[PDB]
Design a protein. Structure first.
Ligand SMILES: [Cl-]
Ligand SMILES: [Cl-]
Ligand SMILES: [Cl-]
Lengths: 5, 99, 99
């Protein structure tokens, strides 16, 4: 998935 | 420039003629900006962060200038604690991590 | 080393003898590791990001090796989707963003 950390 | 990390790496970006502060975020695959209006159509996108998944709006081929470097690419818009510049645009401006 | 942002900047770290994979994240103020036990006392804390907040246990003065460079600092432990090395430890190894 598109991971925004 | 060379940016150290003692403070949050917040820089000025320009999008749609407006200046905004945004965080250079190597932990983000993509760029997520706080609610704003952008031209054209958007498509749905789910992103996962530290607190779970959220739904955002995806706008493609958007012009944005970061610390003076031009980029044109995907910008996601949704509820984010801060404007985030992710790897999709960090690569466009030639950003790397070094130590 | 010079690390490209074409892919997620995942590196090997060593903590408590254990070798692990972690994400170098300039967007994170602190380092957050997936559930594990660490020595010493800890105190609860809440951290937020995309998706909201998660409760973590805060351990101080923990030693970690990141790509061979030692770094000491606070390490938060909790339900993060991936181990994250934040600015509190990136500074210690002299990590910078460059473009
Ligand atoms: Cl893009
Ligand atoms: Cl610390
Ligand atoms: Cl320094």
């Amino acid at each position: 998935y598109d991971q925004i950390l | 420039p060379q940016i150290t990390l003692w403070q949050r790496p917040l820089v000025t970006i320009k999008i749609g003629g407006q200046l905004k502060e945004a965080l250079l975020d190597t932990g983000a695959d993509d760029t997520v900006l706080e609610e704003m209006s952008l031209p054209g159509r958007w498509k749905p996108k789910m992103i996962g962060g530290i607190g779970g998944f959220i739904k955002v709006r995806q706008y493609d081929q958007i012009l944005i200038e970061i610390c003076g470097h031009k980029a044109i690419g995907t910008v996601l818009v949704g509820p984010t604690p801060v404007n985030i510049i992710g790897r999709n645009l960090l690569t466009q401006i030639g950003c790397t991590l070094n130590f």
